[PDB]
Amino acid sequence: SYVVPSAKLEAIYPKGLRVSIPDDGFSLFAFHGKLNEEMDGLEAGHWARDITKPKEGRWTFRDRNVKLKLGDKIYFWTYVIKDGLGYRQDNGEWTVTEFV
Numbered sequence: 001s002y003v004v005p006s007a008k009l010e011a012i013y014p015k016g017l018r019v020s021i022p023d024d025g026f027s028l029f030a031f032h033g034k035l036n037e038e039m040d041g042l043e044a045g046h047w048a049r050d051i052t053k054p055k056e057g058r059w060t061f062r063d064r065n066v067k068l069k070l071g072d073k074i075y076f077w078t079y080v081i082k083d084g085l086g087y088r089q090d091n092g093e094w095t096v097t098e099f100v
């Protein structure tokens with residue numbers, strides 16, 4: 001019913017991944033994703049992590065170590081708890097087009 005804010009993904013140079021969303025009175029944010037490999041629905045994913053506090057208005061997940069390449073695909077879903085209830089951005093797809 002409620003629509004989760006779309007995730008913003010960023011390929012960091014020379015290495016790393018950041019994934020974040022603005023907060024909307026949430027109590028948790030989780031990111032589930034794979035590298036160049038499609039998700040079979042709500043599988044856990046290669047990256048699979050609960051984030052438990054926001055900072056500067058955003059919920060941020062990072063992998064400080066992945067070396068991403070132009071053209072890399074990330075398939076994902078996110079999960080958010082708002083007022084004790086869960087919501088998902090489903091069927092996420094992102095292509096690395098630039099580094100930040």
Ligand SMILES: OC[C@H]1O[C@@H](O[C@@H]2[C@@H](O)[C@H](O[C@@H]3[C@@H](O)[C@H](O[C@@H]4[C@@H](O)[C@H](O[C@@H]5[C@@H](O)[C@H](O[C@@H]6[C@@H](O)[C@H](O)O[C@H](CO)[C@H]6O)O[C@H](CO)[C@H]5O)O[C@H](CO)[C@H]4O)O[C@H](CO)[C@H]3O)O[C@H](CO)[C@H]2O)[C@H](O)[C@@H](O)[C@@H]1O
Nearest residue numbers: 028029030031042043049050051078079080081086087088
């Ligand atoms: O110590 C024991 C054990 O603990 C584990 O750690 C816990 C940890 O895994 C947990 O992490 C949270 C995670 O579970 C949660 O995942 C949810 C997921 O549960 C949800 O799954 C749904 C099912 O709920 C649903 O079941 C249906 C049910 O709702 C309905 O009422 O009845 C149906 C019966 O007819 C039943 O089928 O079925 C659907 C499939 O159709 C599932 O998809 O899905 C959501 C996504 O929608 C998913 O997010 O997410 C939380 C937030 O990210 C996680 O934090 O957290 C616990 C702490 O709170 C931990 O204790 C360990 O892993 C084990 O090793 C330990 O032994």
